[PDB]
Design a protein around this ligand. Sequence first.
Ligand SMILES: *[C@@H]1O[C@H](CO)[C@@H](O[C@@H]2O[C@H](CO)[C@@H](O)[C@H](O)[C@H]2NC(C)=O)[C@H](O)[C@H]1NC(C)=O
Ligand code: NAG
Ligand code: NAG
Ligand code: NAG
Ligand code: NAG
Ligand code: NAG
Ligand code: NAG
Ligand code: NAG
Lengths: 49, 99, 50, 50, 417, 64
Amino acid sequence: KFLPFQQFGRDIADTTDAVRDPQTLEILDITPCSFGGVSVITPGTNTSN
Amino acid sequence: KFNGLTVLPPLLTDEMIAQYTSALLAGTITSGWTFGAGPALQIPFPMQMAYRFNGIGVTQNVLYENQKLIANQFNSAIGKIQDSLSSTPSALGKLQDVV
Amino acid sequence: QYGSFCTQLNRALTGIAVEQDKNTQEVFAQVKQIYKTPPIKDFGGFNFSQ
Amino acid sequence: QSLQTYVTQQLIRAAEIRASANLAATKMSECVLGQSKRVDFCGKGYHLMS
Amino acid sequence: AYSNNSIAIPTNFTISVTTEILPVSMTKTSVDCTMYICGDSTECSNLLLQYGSFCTQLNRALTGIAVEQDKNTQEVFAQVKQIYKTPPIKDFGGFNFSQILPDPSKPSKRSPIEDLLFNKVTLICAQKFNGLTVLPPLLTDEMIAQYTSALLAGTITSGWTFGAGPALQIPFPMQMAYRFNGIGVTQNVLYENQKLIANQFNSAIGKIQDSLSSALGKLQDVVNQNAQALNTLVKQLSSNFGAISSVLNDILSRLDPPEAEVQIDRLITGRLQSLQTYVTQQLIRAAEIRASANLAATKMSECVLGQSKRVDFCGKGYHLMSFPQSAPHGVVFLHVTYVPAQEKNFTTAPAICHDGKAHFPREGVFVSNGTHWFVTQRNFYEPQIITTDNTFVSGNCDVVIGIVNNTVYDPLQPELD
Amino acid sequence: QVAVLYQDVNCNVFQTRAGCLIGAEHVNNSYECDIPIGAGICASYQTSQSIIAYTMSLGAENSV
Ligand SMILES: *[C@@H]1O[C@H](CO)[C@@H](O[C@@H]2O[C@H](CO)[C@@H](O)[C@H](O)[C@H]2NC(C)=O)[C@H](O)[C@H]1NC(C)=O
Ligand SMILES: *[C@@H]1O[C@H](CO)[C@@H](O)[C@H](O)[C@H]1NC(C)=O
Ligand SMILES: *[C@@H]1O[C@H](CO)[C@@H](O)[C@H](O)[C@H]1NC(C)=O
Ligand SMILES: *[C@@H]1O[C@H](CO)[C@@H](O)[C@H](O)[C@H]1NC(C)=O
Ligand SMILES: *[C@@H]1O[C@H](CO)[C@@H](O)[C@H](O)[C@H]1NC(C)=O
Ligand SMILES: *[C@@H]1O[C@H](CO)[C@@H](O)[C@H](O)[C@H]1NC(C)=O
Ligand SMILES: *[C@@H]1O[C@H](CO)[C@@H](O)[C@H](O)[C@H]1NC(C)=O
Ligand SMILES: *[C@@H]1O[C@H](CO)[C@@H](O)[C@H](O)[C@H]1NC(C)=O
């Protein structure tokens, strides 16, 4: 819920909304899409594969 | 969730840490100090307290003659610490500051 | 082309993360065999309910 | 530069916390698993148990 | 199982030995800051000269690190002002010590466990004089082995007193009886089965070799970390850092002097940043190693030179003694400790009263044979008749809860009859 | 009067594992010393008077 004068939005870096279309306005949250590291579990190359 | 920064969960969940603490408490309650130096040997708690009294120079008979007073003082102290831990916000400061 | 700074920083942070688990394990896991208190709490007067 | 500064500060803090954890492990070993004759290693007064 | 009138007393013991490995120092290096970031170039040195006194600071930091490593090696081992020798005859009362003191046959003058530890621990050591060098440790391996052998001879032929003044000789079985009295059990329980204990001791010493032949994680990890940090410092020379090339000669030859400084300075900044990162990481690692060396020195001073009442500081269980051994950039303590086993559960009582007088054990505990009551020592099981010698009187058994009726023998009574 | 030690040199000269050492001469006996050099060897000043180098002595050797 945002006062009907703002256009952008952010808490630290960017979560902007309010699609810039003059005909239609709608609040769209901006979030990443679940980046993440990947790890590997190996019993040992000389034990198994 | 920020960009590029993530937190890994601890290896030992808080339930497991609580289980370890409960195990240590039960061992130190039902077996004195023996469970930390080999197999656990049972011993009545008043007798363990008598041993610990004898370990600081106080004669054994002191506890066996003032057991009721000793138990009452221990219970009162435990209640007092439980009540006092919720008094000031700074009691856990040595942890909180870290975080 | 700025070097191998990324690998150094990642290795340092991973080492810290593993060291935290080592700290917790060596602080709490002093016993390899967990015990249980008896159902009857006849400790001779001492109250451990807290 | 910012990330390097953060990593160095984290390394220092991890060293301090490791020292604290080693002290905690020593206290758990010598105060819970037994009776310690070190005078002010188990709070003020003569130690009984922990 | 817990009951208010039940105790468990161990009727047997096993003597075990545990290995604890601690790194006391790591290899010392000293890179030339001026040479490292300027490969024999006059213009490079001229440009660096205006970049402050960074090189002097880095050199001072590395020199301080090396000095503190020498101090750690000196402090951990050189706890004895005199060098002791084991006597030529190895008659310690059945204790086969031939696995801890050095043997004269091998030219290395190191014990079999010391030799195994030396053989266990192993680009890594060939960087080809790229502005870096290693300095030899102040104490050689032979001198460290001599220190360890002196400590061993002192702790075998003189007990604990050699660390608290002049060394006073004492037969080893009596020293072990002293240690047994220290842990709580009466000394007699040694002499009653001394031979057995000796065998047990030998067996324990005969196992760690196999337990060390199957590890050295701390020492190997320290060596690998240092070697890998040095290698990743050396490898950084090949990065461009945003310049035309990673070689000073190429960028100087290809580009004109007045338009090459703008590109040489970026490479200078990159190399200086890498060297600063290496120095800071080495400082933190040296602080950690110094903490470990202080812990090792404390363990050598308490567990070896004497008997420690601290619960878990010189091995699991009650502590009897310990033997130090050298290792490449580290020390290995063999803690000889005593652990109870084969326990039996009796029914106890805090005190026993008769003729309106209570009686508490002088040093021990009251147990029940099933129909008779006995007083025995705390750890070992050794029943004795409850006489007025083993107990003291206080009260009238109207306040103690758990009093059990029984009779206390008086040694004076049979004389009257 | 001082002595000079190099680090990696195939060198009153005196070869030493820690590097070539000039300005001091080694002695056959050994004393506990105060100026460490390296590789178990170390220098000191002794009574003319000159600077000498020698392997360290661990301590007064004695067997009980
Ligand atoms: C030990 O202390 C606890 C503290 O809670 C006692 O628990 C009380 O139990 C009675 C029994 O119904 C309750 O009415 C009380 O509300 C409980 N709390 C308190 C503060 O009294 C417990 O009785 C004590 N003794 C034992 C043997 O556990
Ligand atoms: C893996 O196991 C084999 C089989 O014994 C052994 O030869 C080898 O040394 C082990 N380690 C590696 C790294 O292959
Ligand atoms: C204690 O255990 C050892 C294990 O070999 C055994 O030889 C010994 O007989 C046991 N003690 C007694 C009193 O039986
Ligand atoms: C008590 O000691 C006697 C010694 O004569 C023994 O015969 C008896 O078996 C013991 N009691 C029990 C319950 O074993
Ligand atoms: C032990 O507890 C039981 C309750 O199960 C009680 O009957 C007995 O009198 C107690 N004995 C002592 C010595 O406290
Ligand atoms: C011990 O003896 C006294 C007097 O002889 C008696 O009053 C008491 O009840 C006895 N104790 C038991 C447990 O029978
Ligand atoms: C050092 O010089 C001596 C004498 O020329 C020679 O024998 C030795 O091999 C040299 N050592 C090295 C490492 O150059
Ligand atoms: C040490 O002894 C050797 C063997 O006799 C001798 O050659 C050497 O000159 C002696 N050292 C000095 C400094 O005289």
